[PDB]
Amino acid sequence: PVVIQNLRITGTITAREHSGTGFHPYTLYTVKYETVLNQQLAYHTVNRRYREFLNLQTRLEEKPDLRKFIKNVKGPKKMDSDRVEARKSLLESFLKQLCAIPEIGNSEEVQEFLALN
């Protein structure tokens, strides 16, 4: 079914959320990727915070029929150019690896995260 290609993080967006007592900036990672139809091609963009990457992993791990596929996938855990790069690469790598596994890539959890469905 879903053919995802060329996933990568191209940058960030800094947004503000309100906590009740005040407004807080936070960082969204801009993920871009393509889906192939058969010779159509769709361009997709989605912005997700670090916390949403974490939740995605947790939601997958919460499911036995899925947790089993990603046991060996290295994912997120709780100036400095090298940290930023390491984290970006880690987050991309995580997403590429999830999407190469058919049972995972086609899961509603990933579809929703990438805003495909």
UniProtKB/Swiss-Prot annotation:
Effect of substituting residue 49 to Q: Abolishes interaction with membranes enriched in phosphatidylinositol 3-phosphate
Location of the PX domain: 7-117
Positions annotated to bind a 1,2-diacyl-sn-glycero-3-phospho-(1D-myo-inositol-3-phosphate): 49, 87
Subcellular location: Early endosome membrane; Cytoplasmic vesicle membrane
Domain of life: Eukaryota
Record's comment describing the protein's domains: The PX domain mediates specific binding to membranes enriched in phosphatidylinositol 3-phosphate (PtdIns(P3)).
Known partners and oligomeric status: Interacts with PTPRN.
Main function: Plays a role in intracellular vesicle trafficking and exocytosis. May play a role in maintaining insulin-containing dense core vesicles in pancreatic beta-cells and in preventing their degradation. May play a role in insulin secretion. Interacts with membranes containing phosphatidylinositol 3-phosphate (PtdIns(3P)).
Family: Belongs to the sorting nexin family.
Protein name: Sorting nexin-19
Species name: Mus musculus (Mouse)
Lineage of origin: Eukaryota, Metazoa, Chordata, Craniata, Vertebrata
Primary gene name: Snx19
Part of the intact protein present: 532 to 664 of 997
